[PDB]
Amino acid sequence: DAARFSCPPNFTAKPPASESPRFSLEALTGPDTELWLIQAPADFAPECFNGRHVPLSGSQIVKGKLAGKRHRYRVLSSCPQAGEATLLAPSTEAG
Amino acid sequence: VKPKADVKRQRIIEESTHCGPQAVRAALNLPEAASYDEVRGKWQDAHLGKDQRDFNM
Amino acid sequence: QIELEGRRPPLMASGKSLPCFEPYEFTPRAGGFVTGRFLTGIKPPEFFFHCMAGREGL
Amino acid sequence: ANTCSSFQSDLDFCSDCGSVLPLPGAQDTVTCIRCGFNINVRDFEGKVVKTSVVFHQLGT
Amino acid sequence: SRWRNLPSGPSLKHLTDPSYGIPREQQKAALQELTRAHVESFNYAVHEGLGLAVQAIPPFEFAFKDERISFTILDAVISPPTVPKGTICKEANVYPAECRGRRSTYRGKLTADINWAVNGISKGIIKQFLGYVPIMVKSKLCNLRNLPPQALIEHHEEAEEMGGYFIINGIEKVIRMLIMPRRNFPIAMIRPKWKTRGPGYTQYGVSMHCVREEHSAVNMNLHYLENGTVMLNFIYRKELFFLPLGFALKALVSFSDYQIFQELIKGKEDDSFLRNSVSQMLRIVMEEGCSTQKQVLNYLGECFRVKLNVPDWYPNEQAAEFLFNQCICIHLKSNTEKFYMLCLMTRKLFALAKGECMEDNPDSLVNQEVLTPGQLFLMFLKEKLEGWLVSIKIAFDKKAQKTSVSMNTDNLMRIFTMGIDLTKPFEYLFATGNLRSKTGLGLLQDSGLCVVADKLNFIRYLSHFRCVHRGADFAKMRTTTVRRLLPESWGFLCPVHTPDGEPCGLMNHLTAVCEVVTQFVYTASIPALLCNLGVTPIDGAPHRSYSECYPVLLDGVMVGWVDKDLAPGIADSLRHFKVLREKRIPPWMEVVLIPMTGKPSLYPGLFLFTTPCRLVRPVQNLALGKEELIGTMEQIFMNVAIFEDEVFAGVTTHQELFPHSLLSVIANFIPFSDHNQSPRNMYQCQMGKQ
Amino acid sequence: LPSARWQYCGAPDGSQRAVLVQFSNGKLQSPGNMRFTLYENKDSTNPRKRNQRILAAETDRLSYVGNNFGTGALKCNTLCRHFVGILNKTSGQMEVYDAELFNMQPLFSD
Amino acid sequence: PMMSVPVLNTKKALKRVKSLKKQLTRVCLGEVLQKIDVQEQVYQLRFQFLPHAYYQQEKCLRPEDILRFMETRFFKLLMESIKKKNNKASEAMERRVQAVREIHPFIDDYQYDTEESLWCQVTVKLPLMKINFDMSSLVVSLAHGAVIYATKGITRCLLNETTNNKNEKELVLNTEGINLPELFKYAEVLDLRRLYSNDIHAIANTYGIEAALRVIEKEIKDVFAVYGIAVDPRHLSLVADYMCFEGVYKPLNRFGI
RNA sequence: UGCUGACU
DNA sequence: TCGCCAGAGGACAGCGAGTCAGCAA
DNA sequence: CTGTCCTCTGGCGA
């Protein structure tokens, strides 16, 4: 017998989102869709890059504006390394 | 020391400031010339070596 | 020419003999060759190398 | 799952050394698989080419 | 700055000035910065460090009759000196002018408020009077603080004095900065007398000297055994105990054996003797009986319970935590951080063993730090407070073991029964100089800790607050290699100022511009800034191969793995912050980046020290002209011109403030020292003090 | 060099988060047979507890558990932030979302 | 330790000495090797020896002798060390291979190199349970202290061409080891009278004690000479006569009393 | 008696 | 088949003279 | 620190 994870009494299972068709497995497996993992400093404001052209290879300095102050962010793009975080998505197939 | 004798001393001291590369190189038995950075690397290797008798050379 | 253990002054762990000298510097000055005399004193690095040798003696 | 030849893969700790044919189920969670691995672990390694050698060092 | 307004040529029109005898409005400020390391250390030791010391102080629970009693020390406070009790009249204060006339100690009152409980529902806060602790002269717990030179003359004082000393029986003991290995940094060492520690030990090992908040120090050694296995030696109460690694790693972290392994093979994931030796550490001694964190803690608890002297009603799992808290990596609060630090020290022994790294000389100032008067004072205070608790409750358990219900009537009569202790023990360390402690305080020396400061001259006196003693044990050694004046003490120790007989090379003196760090800062926003700069947290996704990455450390805590092409820019950015006082980088953080090549150079990685006992020295930062402060280890990877016209474009990152910065304070009083031979400047320094 | 136009469609209230998993013992050879269940704390009034989550993964042989709180919560979840970018190759537009990273670990009880 | 025998001053002796110097220097397996290639319980090993261009010049070695050495000494010291570890752990190619595996039960087959030691490997296997680690460590710590052949006690010779101005024609075969009898075979190449060594215990065993007295005296004199000091011979005579009083070279220390 | 300094 | 050539570590014992002072146990 | 002195210490043919 596998001791089956037992959920603590103060926790409840979160249902899937049927109102989420975006992170749906179907949407993510589309031939024109690519998934990217992004790591940033804790104080990084992603909105500062809105409309700006982030690189898909190499290293580039990208300028962002936050609260009126100009910030410049070095962006490094790479080939996924074996062992990287896997994205979980709701699947109708998985009940 | 007499002047006209410290001028020769000064010129010899000026000449002595150019005798390191040749000395070290011709002691590592490196190509006689054409290497100016291989010599620094060979000296570094001889310095971090374990035996340390190519450094005393 | 300063000589401590029968050898020139020792290098640091980074390859420089003294904070003033580039690492692995070829000039004899960087190895303890003092061209100054007590008539006209010896610059600050030569004073340090000379001090290592006088202390080795004591 | 992608852990090699000394761990449990599913679990976490490291298995014991081989004696009987079956993968030696660990003291915890004794599940077994791959009694004897397909290929013996082959290792490609050699020595250095400056001191031990009189070759590779004619000049340089 | 602090070296501006330095005279350009001497003058003689200051004597023969109409104001020669008028006492000045404020004290000199250049003479004050000499004993500054002795006073700013004590100021912390007695106010901000004492609270932290008492905060550790595990509550001393023990059994009375069939009852269990808990005693905790909530606060301890040292008061300025004062007339004993009120039995005296007309002036409560007590100024150091007396106790020199009389022959007595300038001692302040140390009192704490203990809190005793019976199971935690019955409690009362009593305020016991612990004893008397000596006080430094201008130390914030002294009566001569904040006095101008004119008011310092009506009390019979020097009008130019900087105390930095103690008056133990009117003798002015001058406890001097001893040399310690380092703090919170793993030093890889090749000592051949280590293979005698056991059957298969080798002459390789990384030592770490751990200090927590300046109140606790501990020394832990990771040894390499010939099998490829690593052992851990810890010392508790002067006894050496050897625990295989794996027992320690499994206890500290509830992680799988493969995850512990994936960590100790981070940079050498192709090597196969290592991969095989890591597995032998995890399986050979741990799959032999204990495979869950608790069983490891339980086994470790049973073997060590007898010599850790733990409470009898303690589960073995609780006795294990006691060992890890009090003996291994004192500096780190977390057990997860303590795991990552033991893993980097091992990853380093594997590189020293395979000859991929150079042994760190313990005798280079790169791998050395100083022990100030406040670290010795607090580290003795804390130990004596723990001893006081133990003795009061020895008396407790021994008196009657009798129905504490009504015995709450004599509880104070009980605590006072052993509160008669803390005074004389403290004066021994100061009047005699030698240390009587159950744990030697992570020190290695037990004598010559405090010395008489004699005012034969003001050049004998000023040299007691700038002396640095390599150690008192090295005065007895056949080999003379701790007497070599290496080129790494450039600007930090004077070449000329050394005693010229039996103490030669062992008693050094700081240059005029050198200084000890003594401030304590937050250093909490630094780990979050390093990540903005380009570091990737120890948790994962390095973005490269763990071999083309630098292991980032910040005061014992491994932030982790700045990429190899981002390490230079990160070091330069951090150096620009400290110089311009941006972010919260302390003006004195040492950003070190030991580069990595294929050669057996010192182990690579970006360190960042900000601890309170390192030596620093000013240098004019070129390219900014902003008077940076560099440390003993940070100075080995940078070019520092002395004279201008010696500055170059790519070379000469920095420049020195004055050309005579290298020489001590006394060696700067010798005229034309450049034209005399050096053994003569060493005798002049010793003759100007007689 | 190939580039993408950055857009943070992100989370409407920031209540929405994606879910990233990392296994402490390596890569799962067959992630297709795993069932993941995300658990959240019932206490929505306590700001400290309202963000506590447990991720459980069940296989035939073992269970994995990851949490964003307590010892199992690791430093990377805060010092750094994680995002997921969804790139439309045709439009060159990258949509960026907040992500939560769970470090997964095996399940056993005495 | 050292020696110094003059060279006999004859045309034949001068020619034979070159070979003599090249004959007494130690050649060790490690001084002749390029790099090993270890594969691993079936542990193979290819030695890949150096070409003769740059080591036969001053070592007097030949490849058949060197390889024969591996078959008879290294490949069995290897099993000796494997047992050292495993005791406390818990047409013509054919005859050579056959005799070699006649003597050991682990090896299978090596190789042959009919062209200047092209590829010379070996294969072993311990099939049941052995500690499979990077045994390259053992076969490298052993391929250093493994010496092809050396005169016992002599580590290197050298001919310091000139030692005299009066009769400049002198040649000396100095050595950095000490084996007196292993030079007695060259009484026609070298002058065995005039043989000198700084050992004083070896002289006292090959020539007697009255010959060690003078070596003691000359050693003390040459020690003082490097500093210009000069103690009178009448003092060293008494010291050497007292030290060698009772037939043996006795130390002047706590065990001599 | 010991620890700290100190002299040639 | 264990005696003696070899072979290992462990233990001990030495570490220049002679002076002057103070402080403290 | 380094040296001898000392005490074992199990290992192949006679």
Numbering used by the authors:
A (entry chain N): 8 to 102
B (entry chain A): 804 to 860
C (entry chain A): 918 to 975
D (entry chain I): 7 to 66
E (entry chain B): 5 to 694
F (entry chain M): 6 to 115
G (entry chain A): 1262 to 1301, 1313 to 1362, 1496 to 1662
Question: What did the authors write?
Answer:
The RPAC1 and RPAC2, two shared subunits of Pol I/III, interact with each other and pack against the wall of Pol I. The TFIIS-like subunit RPA12 has an N-terminal zinc ribbon (N-ribbon), which packs against the dimerization domain of TFIIF-like PAF53/PAF49 heterodimer and the lobe of RPA2. We performed glutaraldehyde crosslinking to prepare ECpost followed by structure determination, generating improved cryo-EM density around RPA43, PAF53, and PAF49.
The hPol I consists of 13 subunits and the yeast Pol I (yPol I) has similar counterparts with an additional yeast-specific subunit, A14. The overall hPol I EC structures reveal a more closed DNA-binding clamp and a flexible one-subunit stalk.
